[PDB]
Each structure stands twice: as structure tokens, then as C-alpha cells.
């Protein structure tokens, strides 16, 4: 056993000027309501802003991409649908591997928009981060923005666009198994 | 360090 995924958010990605295909992103509504409603609206825009035109502006091979930063861009901003920030829903889902999707912030509850998939077993995050989905399609995608070319601020030469984002409704919910659960 | 922050990135 382990949680059911009972939504899906697609992420359509192009690096430069080149369409280097979609994430899929499996989300556990019923584990953290609060925290996957913040990134479906998010993923849809149907606040009239949202992930679309943003970009993973910090990769580092080995750790994590990091995207989703809507308002100015530069990583440092970023806003959720209930205010600028809101409080860790829960920790119940860890980093448990390779593709777990967790919400970045600036300390204890201060979630907003940006978030990162994990490229190792960040088990340091543990309880710090709110994990609420997981990569299901698409991890040749992620490996491919994991793989470009970064300076100094580990930032990307070449930026690495959400060019569109929007839900796929999950009409059979399935369980994404985990040890011990 | 290895850390995901959104303003103040740290080591
Ligand atoms: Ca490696
Ligand atoms: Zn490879």
C-alpha cells in the first residue's frame, strides 16, 4: 500500500528554442488537499497567473531541478493562491527517492509557488519540505534539464521554459506503493 | 550546502 495519486498535472517544456517533451506529475489530494489544490490552480491558471512562462532556474545535477518561481523570476519570488505564503500542510510524505515533487521555502512556513523534483534521496529535506506528488511520466525530460549547462548560481545558460502547464483528470486513482506505510 | 530556498540561497 502507500497514497493514491487522484491528479495529474502536465508541465510541456522547451529548452531554447528546441520542444524537449512533458513532465507528468502525480499528486496525493488525499494526503495534502491543500498544498495540491496551491499547484493544480497554479498549473492551470485559473487564478489568471500560474506556472505557465515560468522556468527551472536553478539545476543541480545529482540534487534537484527547482521551478515555478511566477512573479519575478529570478527565484527569489512567487506566490501561492491562498496569499503570499501558507503554512506546512504536513510532513507525511518523505523524499524518498529519485522524481518526488516538494515544495520549496524560506524557512518553516513560508510555501508559495515554487517547488523542485528530486534528482537523489534528499532524506536531509525530511520533514522540512512538504513532499505532494511524484514524477509518473516524463523522467527523460527531467534528466534532460538536469544535464544543461549551469554558471556559477547553478542557474541554467540556457533557460529551461514551462512553455504550456495545465491537469489531466485521473479517472482510476492508483496507489504509488511505499515502504512501511 | 544542499538546500531549496526560495530569496536567500545558502551553501
Ligand atoms: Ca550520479
Ligand atoms: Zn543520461
Redesign the interface.
Same mark, same amino acid.
Given at each position: 500500500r502507500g497514497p493514491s495519486v487522484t491528479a495529474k498535472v502536465f508541465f510541456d517544456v522547451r529548452i531554447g528554442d528546441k520542444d524537449v517533451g512533458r513532465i507528468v506529475i502525480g499528486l496525493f489530494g488525499k494526503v495534502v488537499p491543500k498544498t495540491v489544490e496551491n499547484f493544480v490552480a497554479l498549473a492551470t491558471g485559473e487564478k489568471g497567473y500560474g506556472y505557465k512562462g515560468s522556468k527551472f532556474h536553478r539545476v543541480i545535477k545529482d540534487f534537484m531541478i527547482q521551478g515555478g518561481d511566477i512573479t519575478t523570476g529570478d527565484g527569489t519570488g512567487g506566490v501561492s493562491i491562498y496569499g503570499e505564503t501558507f503554512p506546512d500542510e504536513n510532513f507525511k510524505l518523505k523524499h524518498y527517492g529519485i522524481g518526488w515533487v516538494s515544495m520549496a521555502n524560506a524557512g518553516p512556513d513560508t510555501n508559495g509557488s515554487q517547488f523542485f523534483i528530486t534528482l537523489t534521496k534528499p532524506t536531509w529535506l525530511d520533514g522540512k519540505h512538504v513532499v505532494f506528488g511524484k514524477v509518473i511520466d516524463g523522467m527523460t525530460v527531467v534528466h534532460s534539464i538536469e544535464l544543461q549547462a549551469t554558471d556559477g548560481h547553478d542557474r541554467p545558460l540556457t533557460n529551461c521554459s514551462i512553455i504550456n502547464s495545465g491537469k489531466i483528470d485521473v479517472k482510476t486513482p492508483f496507489v504509488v506503493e511505499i515502504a512501511d506505510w | 550546502x #544542499? #538546500? *531549496?530556498?526560495?530569496? #536567500? *540561497?545558502l551553501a
Open positions: - | #544542499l #538546500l *531549496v530556498t526560495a530569496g #536567500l *540561497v
